[PDB]
Ligand SMILES: O=c1ccn([C@@H]2O[C@H](COP(=O)(O)OP(=O)(O)OP(=O)(O)O)[C@@H](O)[C@H]2O)c(=O)[nH]1
């Protein structure tokens with residue numbers, strides 16, 4: 001197994017109300033877990049626990065190896081679009097090209113005279129919300145890691161573009177990788193190996209899309 005939570009309860013503030021309550025799941029190596037639930041349900045907090053920023057007050061957690069995290073808040077640092085995606089990782093042309101293709105960024109980049117050397121975050125280009133989101137996703141996917149934590153990475157994208165990038169990037173390009181995707185969309189839950197729906201910190205549902213269909 002690659003990631004396990006067993007009877008996990010946790011608090012952001014001692015004496016407070018629990019942000020996660022008796023959470024249980026298991027992800028095998030290479031599987032996809034979809035994490036869903038309304039605002040404040042605890043989805044980002046669950047990712048923070050995997051990254052060691054929140055410790056459990058009850059229960060056990062298993063995870064090993066390097067993590068790549070994509071925040072639900074897209075961000076850019078001053079530098080080229082290539083520098084933002086590589087972000088200090090060693091460069092490889094094939095790997096880089098495959099990521100920008102999977103994130104539909106080749107279309108955006110081809111329109112600039114400077115191509116991948118277009119400068120972001122320095123007052124020149126003003127990126128759209130969807131461009132910043134796809135760049136942030138590409139940055140997280142380019143990093144080599146054992147576990148990918150993709151926190152609602154499809155911000156500002158229309159539903160067809162989100163569907164296409166879910167398929168090209170999360171399902172195809174990342175097919176061999178252990179993935180946790182915070183998402184609410186039906187196709188993503190249907191394609192996931194497991195689904196965890198959180199509600200006010202509790203497990204609203206844990207299982208497969210097919211199991212939920214049969215209910
Ligand atoms: O650092 C933190 C983070 C979160 N919290 C508190 O943990 C609770 C869950 O906060 P989350 O940030 O985990 O919820 P979420 O990801 O499911 O919500 P969305 O992004 O979809 O909007 C929230 O009630 C928050 O106030 C803290 O107290 N401190």
Ligand SMILES: [Mg+2]
Nearest residue numbers: 043044045072
């Ligand atoms: Mg969140």
